[PDB]
mmCIF file of all heavy atoms in Angstrom:
data_model
loop_
_atom_site.group_PDB
_atom_site.id
_atom_site.type_symbol
_atom_site.label_atom_id
_atom_site.label_comp_id
_atom_site.label_asym_id
_atom_site.label_seq_id
_atom_site.Cartn_x
_atom_site.Cartn_y
_atom_site.Cartn_z
ATOM 1 N N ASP U 277 -111.864 -69.944 178.477
ATOM 2 C CA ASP U 277 -112.746 -69.143 179.376
ATOM 3 C C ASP U 277 -111.902 -68.026 179.944
ATOM 4 O O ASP U 277 -110.752 -67.877 179.733
ATOM 5 C CB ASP U 277 -113.327 -69.979 180.444
ATOM 6 C CG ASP U 277 -114.673 -69.434 180.862
ATOM 7 O OD1 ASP U 277 -115.446 -69.086 179.954
ATOM 8 O OD2 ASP U 277 -115.040 -69.600 182.042
ATOM 9 N N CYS U 278 -112.566 -67.130 180.872
ATOM 10 C CA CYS U 278 -111.822 -65.976 181.384
ATOM 11 C C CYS U 278 -111.681 -66.053 182.785
ATOM 12 O O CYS U 278 -112.757 -66.642 183.521
ATOM 13 C CB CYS U 278 -112.595 -64.649 180.899
ATOM 14 S SG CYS U 278 -112.701 -64.399 179.142
ATOM 15 N N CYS U 279 -110.698 -65.659 183.431
ATOM 16 C CA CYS U 279 -110.638 -65.348 184.742
ATOM 17 C C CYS U 279 -111.672 -64.261 184.995
ATOM 18 O O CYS U 279 -111.778 -63.229 184.275
ATOM 19 C CB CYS U 279 -109.282 -64.709 185.181
ATOM 20 S SG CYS U 279 -107.924 -65.978 185.011
ATOM 21 N N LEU U 280 -112.642 -64.404 186.058
ATOM 22 C CA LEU U 280 -113.536 -63.456 186.547
ATOM 23 C C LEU U 280 -113.113 -62.840 187.820
ATOM 24 O O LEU U 280 -113.703 -61.880 188.247
ATOM 25 C CB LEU U 280 -114.822 -64.046 186.518
ATOM 26 C CG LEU U 280 -115.354 -64.779 185.417
ATOM 27 C CD1 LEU U 280 -116.667 -65.495 185.702
ATOM 28 C CD2 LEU U 280 -115.474 -63.848 184.178
ATOM 29 N N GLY U 281 -112.035 -63.245 188.390
ATOM 30 C CA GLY U 281 -111.602 -62.928 189.670
ATOM 31 C C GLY U 281 -110.239 -63.566 189.970
ATOM 32 O O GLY U 281 -109.737 -64.257 189.141
ATOM 33 N N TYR U 282 -109.657 -63.354 191.171
ATOM 34 C CA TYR U 282 -108.248 -63.703 191.556
ATOM 35 C C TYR U 282 -108.190 -64.661 192.676
ATOM 36 O O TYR U 282 -109.137 -64.536 193.585
ATOM 37 C CB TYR U 282 -107.407 -62.411 191.619
ATOM 38 C CG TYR U 282 -107.567 -61.442 190.595
ATOM 39 C CD1 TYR U 282 -107.765 -60.081 190.852
ATOM 40 C CD2 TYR U 282 -107.219 -61.776 189.226
ATOM 41 C CE1 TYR U 282 -107.926 -59.104 189.868
ATOM 42 C CE2 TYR U 282 -107.411 -60.773 188.210
ATOM 43 C CZ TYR U 282 -107.626 -59.481 188.539
ATOM 44 O OH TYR U 282 -107.731 -58.514 187.582
ATOM 45 N N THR U 283 -107.166 -65.463 192.823
ATOM 46 C CA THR U 283 -107.023 -66.238 193.932
ATOM 47 C C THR U 283 -106.695 -65.428 195.151
ATOM 48 O O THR U 283 -106.123 -64.296 194.997
ATOM 49 C CB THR U 283 -105.909 -67.257 193.711
ATOM 50 O OG1 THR U 283 -105.722 -68.117 194.805
ATOM 51 C CG2 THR U 283 -104.462 -66.616 193.597
ATOM 52 N N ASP U 284 -107.147 -65.876 196.358
ATOM 53 C CA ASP U 284 -106.987 -65.176 197.496
ATOM 54 C C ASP U 284 -105.675 -65.649 198.373
ATOM 55 O O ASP U 284 -105.361 -65.162 199.374
ATOM 56 C CB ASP U 284 -108.152 -65.319 198.498
ATOM 57 C CG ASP U 284 -108.524 -66.752 198.873
ATOM 58 O OD1 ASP U 284 -107.899 -67.677 198.082
ATOM 59 O OD2 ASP U 284 -109.114 -66.971 199.861
ATOM 60 N N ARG U 285 -104.912 -66.639 197.729
ATOM 61 C CA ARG U 285 -103.821 -67.267 198.447
ATOM 62 C C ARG U 285 -102.533 -67.251 197.592
ATOM 63 O O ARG U 285 -102.604 -67.413 196.354
ATOM 64 C CB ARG U 285 -104.189 -68.665 198.794
ATOM 65 C CG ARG U 285 -104.655 -68.768 200.220
ATOM 66 C CD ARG U 285 -105.356 -70.223 200.464
ATOM 67 N NE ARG U 285 -106.658 -70.190 199.942
ATOM 68 C CZ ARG U 285 -107.582 -71.099 199.983
ATOM 69 N NH1 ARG U 285 -107.422 -72.143 200.846
ATOM 70 N NH2 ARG U 285 -108.833 -71.046 199.304
ATOM 71 N N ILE U 286 -101.363 -66.893 198.089
ATOM 72 C CA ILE U 286 -100.190 -66.968 197.548
ATOM 73 C C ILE U 286 -100.039 -68.396 197.065
ATOM 74 O O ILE U 286 -100.181 -69.340 197.997
ATOM 75 C CB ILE U 286 -99.008 -66.479 198.443
ATOM 76 C CG1 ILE U 286 -99.152 -65.069 198.615
ATOM 77 C CG2 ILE U 286 -97.687 -66.894 197.827
ATOM 78 C CD1 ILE U 286 -97.915 -64.342 199.346
ATOM 79 N N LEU U 287 -99.519 -68.696 195.862
ATOM 80 C CA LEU U 287 -99.347 -70.023 195.436
ATOM 81 C C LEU U 287 -97.708 -70.251 195.426
ATOM 82 O O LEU U 287 -97.026 -69.384 194.864
ATOM 83 C CB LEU U 287 -99.782 -70.234 193.995
ATOM 84 C CG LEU U 287 -99.879 -71.508 193.327
ATOM 85 C CD1 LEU U 287 -100.557 -72.515 194.270
ATOM 86 C CD2 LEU U 287 -100.484 -71.492 191.895
ATOM 87 N N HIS U 288 -97.322 -71.296 195.852
ATOM 88 C CA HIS U 288 -95.809 -71.497 196.074
ATOM 89 C C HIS U 288 -95.182 -71.676 194.757
ATOM 90 O O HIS U 288 -95.756 -72.703 194.006
ATOM 91 C CB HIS U 288 -95.444 -72.701 196.993
ATOM 92 C CG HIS U 288 -93.948 -72.637 197.417
ATOM 93 N ND1 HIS U 288 -92.920 -72.799 196.509
ATOM 94 C CD2 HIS U 288 -93.413 -72.419 198.584
ATOM 95 C CE1 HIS U 288 -91.747 -72.668 197.031
ATOM 96 N NE2 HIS U 288 -91.982 -72.542 198.415
ATOM 97 N N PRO U 289 -94.156 -71.132 194.361
ATOM 98 C CA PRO U 289 -93.506 -71.364 192.999
ATOM 99 C C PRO U 289 -93.140 -72.758 192.782
ATOM 100 O O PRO U 289 -92.945 -73.095 191.631
ATOM 101 C CB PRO U 289 -92.234 -70.453 192.996
ATOM 102 C CG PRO U 289 -92.473 -69.588 194.197
ATOM 103 C CD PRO U 289 -93.475 -70.045 195.121
ATOM 104 N N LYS U 290 -92.783 -73.589 193.816
ATOM 105 C CA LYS U 290 -92.537 -74.986 193.567
ATOM 106 C C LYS U 290 -93.540 -75.725 192.886
ATOM 107 O O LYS U 290 -93.306 -76.888 192.356
ATOM 108 C CB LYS U 290 -92.045 -75.531 194.887
ATOM 109 C CG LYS U 290 -93.136 -75.916 195.826
ATOM 110 C CD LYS U 290 -92.544 -76.475 197.118
ATOM 111 C CE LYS U 290 -93.533 -76.598 198.187
ATOM 112 N NZ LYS U 290 -92.858 -76.532 199.568
ATOM 113 N N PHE U 291 -94.826 -75.397 192.982
ATOM 114 C CA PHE U 291 -95.999 -75.900 192.343
ATOM 115 C C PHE U 291 -96.243 -75.282 190.905
ATOM 116 O O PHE U 291 -97.113 -75.774 190.162
ATOM 117 C CB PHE U 291 -97.130 -75.867 193.140
ATOM 118 C CG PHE U 291 -96.979 -76.544 194.611
ATOM 119 C CD1 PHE U 291 -97.036 -75.847 195.676
ATOM 120 C CD2 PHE U 291 -96.825 -77.914 194.567
ATOM 121 C CE1 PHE U 291 -96.829 -76.360 196.880
ATOM 122 C CE2 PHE U 291 -96.437 -78.494 195.707
ATOM 123 C CZ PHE U 291 -96.559 -77.689 196.932
ATOM 124 N N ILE U 292 -95.494 -74.182 190.446
ATOM 125 C CA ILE U 292 -95.992 -73.477 189.338
ATOM 126 C C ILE U 292 -94.913 -73.811 188.198
ATOM 127 O O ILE U 292 -93.722 -73.860 188.451
ATOM 128 C CB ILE U 292 -95.965 -72.016 189.810
ATOM 129 C CG1 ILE U 292 -97.086 -71.730 190.574
ATOM 130 C CG2 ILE U 292 -96.008 -71.123 188.435
ATOM 131 C CD1 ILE U 292 -97.085 -70.275 191.164
ATOM 132 N N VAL U 293 -95.464 -74.036 187.046
ATOM 133 C CA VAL U 293 -94.748 -74.391 185.843
ATOM 134 C C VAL U 293 -94.760 -73.346 184.710
ATOM 135 O O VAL U 293 -94.126 -73.414 183.673
ATOM 136 C CB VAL U 293 -95.025 -75.855 185.400
ATOM 137 C CG1 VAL U 293 -94.668 -76.713 186.427
ATOM 138 C CG2 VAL U 293 -96.406 -75.892 184.874
ATOM 139 N N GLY U 294 -95.669 -72.382 184.750
ATOM 140 C CA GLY U 294 -95.770 -71.369 183.676
ATOM 141 C C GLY U 294 -96.895 -70.421 183.943
ATOM 142 O O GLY U 294 -97.518 -70.339 185.053
ATOM 143 N N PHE U 295 -97.104 -69.612 183.059
ATOM 144 C CA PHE U 295 -98.249 -68.588 183.158
ATOM 145 C C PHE U 295 -98.773 -68.277 181.791
ATOM 146 O O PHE U 295 -97.937 -68.357 180.693
ATOM 147 C CB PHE U 295 -97.726 -67.364 183.907
ATOM 148 C CG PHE U 295 -96.778 -66.420 183.099
ATOM 149 C CD1 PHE U 295 -97.274 -65.412 182.225
ATOM 150 C CD2 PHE U 295 -95.495 -66.578 183.281
ATOM 151 C CE1 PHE U 295 -96.429 -64.672 181.465
ATOM 152 C CE2 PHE U 295 -94.587 -65.773 182.467
ATOM 153 C CZ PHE U 295 -95.017 -64.822 181.632
ATOM 154 N N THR U 296 -99.964 -67.755 181.705
ATOM 155 C CA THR U 296 -100.558 -67.103 180.560
ATOM 156 C C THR U 296 -101.038 -65.762 180.867
ATOM 157 O O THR U 296 -101.732 -65.632 181.992
ATOM 158 C CB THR U 296 -101.672 -67.991 180.088
ATOM 159 O OG1 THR U 296 -101.094 -69.194 179.352
ATOM 160 C CG2 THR U 296 -102.705 -67.109 179.034
ATOM 161 N N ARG U 297 -100.841 -64.768 180.053
ATOM 162 C CA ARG U 297 -101.515 -63.337 180.301
ATOM 163 C C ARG U 297 -102.904 -63.360 179.815
ATOM 164 O O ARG U 297 -103.100 -63.735 178.667
ATOM 165 C CB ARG U 297 -100.559 -62.300 179.970
ATOM 166 C CG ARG U 297 -100.717 -61.765 178.631
ATOM 167 C CD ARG U 297 -100.316 -62.719 177.407
ATOM 168 N NE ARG U 297 -100.429 -62.218 176.121
ATOM 169 C CZ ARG U 297 -101.632 -62.093 175.462
ATOM 170 N NH1 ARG U 297 -102.783 -62.605 176.153
ATOM 171 N NH2 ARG U 297 -101.625 -61.586 174.239
ATOM 172 N N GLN U 298 -103.717 -62.826 180.615
ATOM 173 C CA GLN U 298 -105.192 -62.553 180.094
ATOM 174 C C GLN U 298 -105.285 -61.022 180.140
ATOM 175 O O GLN U 298 -105.034 -60.329 181.148
ATOM 176 C CB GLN U 298 -106.156 -63.160 180.992
ATOM 177 C CG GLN U 298 -107.654 -62.855 180.690
ATOM 178 C CD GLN U 298 -108.617 -63.336 181.653
ATOM 179 O OE1 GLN U 298 -108.624 -64.523 181.824
ATOM 180 N NE2 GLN U 298 -109.403 -62.413 182.316
ATOM 181 N N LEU U 299 -105.636 -60.531 178.922
ATOM 182 C CA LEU U 299 -105.748 -59.150 178.717
ATOM 183 C C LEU U 299 -107.302 -58.734 178.579
ATOM 184 O O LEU U 299 -108.049 -59.377 178.007
ATOM 185 C CB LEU U 299 -104.997 -58.638 177.417
ATOM 186 C CG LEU U 299 -103.498 -58.955 177.521
ATOM 187 C CD1 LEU U 299 -102.866 -58.587 176.174
ATOM 188 C CD2 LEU U 299 -102.727 -58.328 178.605
ATOM 189 N N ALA U 300 -107.462 -57.500 179.201
ATOM 190 C CA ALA U 300 -108.857 -56.868 179.025
ATOM 191 C C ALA U 300 -109.023 -56.362 177.670
ATOM 192 O O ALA U 300 -108.289 -55.416 177.245
ATOM 193 C CB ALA U 300 -108.986 -55.726 180.057
ATOM 194 N N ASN U 301 -109.824 -57.119 176.845
ATOM 195 C CA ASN U 301 -109.996 -56.808 175.530
ATOM 196 C C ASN U 301 -111.354 -57.339 175.070
ATOM 197 O O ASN U 301 -112.213 -57.660 175.953
ATOM 198 C CB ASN U 301 -108.842 -57.313 174.687
ATOM 199 C CG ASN U 301 -108.715 -58.833 174.797
ATOM 200 O OD1 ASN U 301 -109.503 -59.679 175.202
ATOM 201 N ND2 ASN U 301 -107.498 -59.345 174.625
ATOM 202 N N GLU U 302 -111.591 -57.535 173.686
ATOM 203 C CA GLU U 302 -112.868 -58.157 173.255
ATOM 204 C C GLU U 302 -113.012 -59.508 173.804
ATOM 205 O O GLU U 302 -114.257 -59.910 173.939
ATOM 206 C CB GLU U 302 -112.828 -58.083 171.806
ATOM 207 C CG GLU U 302 -112.482 -56.846 171.137
ATOM 208 C CD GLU U 302 -111.218 -56.937 170.273
ATOM 209 O OE1 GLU U 302 -110.167 -57.177 170.840
ATOM 210 O OE2 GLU U 302 -111.332 -56.771 169.021
ATOM 211 N N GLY U 303 -111.921 -60.220 174.185
ATOM 212 C CA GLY U 303 -112.170 -61.528 174.673
ATOM 213 C C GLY U 303 -112.510 -61.671 176.148
ATOM 214 O O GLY U 303 -113.544 -62.336 176.377
ATOM 215 N N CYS U 304 -111.886 -61.057 177.085
ATOM 216 C CA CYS U 304 -112.167 -61.077 178.581
ATOM 217 C C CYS U 304 -112.293 -59.626 179.058
ATOM 218 O O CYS U 304 -111.721 -58.746 178.653
ATOM 219 C CB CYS U 304 -111.057 -61.845 179.265
ATOM 220 S SG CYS U 304 -110.904 -63.556 178.768
ATOM 221 N N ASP U 305 -113.054 -59.619 180.284
ATOM 222 C CA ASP U 305 -113.292 -58.235 180.872
ATOM 223 C C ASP U 305 -112.273 -57.821 181.790
ATOM 224 O O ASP U 305 -112.192 -56.584 181.933
ATOM 225 C CB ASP U 305 -114.668 -58.280 181.454
ATOM 226 C CG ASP U 305 -115.826 -58.530 180.524
ATOM 227 O OD1 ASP U 305 -115.966 -57.927 179.506
ATOM 228 O OD2 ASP U 305 -116.799 -59.362 180.822
#
C-alpha cells in the first residue's frame, strides 16, 4: 500500500531499525 500522508510526531531513532523510500510514480501518488 502507499503512504497517503505523514506522521505528525518525531519518532525517536532508538525505536527505528530501517526505512523504505516511496516515490511518486505509477505506484503511489
Side-chain angles (χ1 to χ4, degrees):
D277 213 38
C278 299
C279 297
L280 308 175
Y282 309 124
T283 185
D284 62 339
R285 263 159 291 189
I286 294 187
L287 191 53
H288 195 298
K290 70 185 170 203
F291 302 116
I292 292 174
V293 300
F295 72 87
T296 284
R297 91 286 182 283
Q298 173 182 306
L299 302 175
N301 58 24
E302 308 115 298
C304 299
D305 295 316

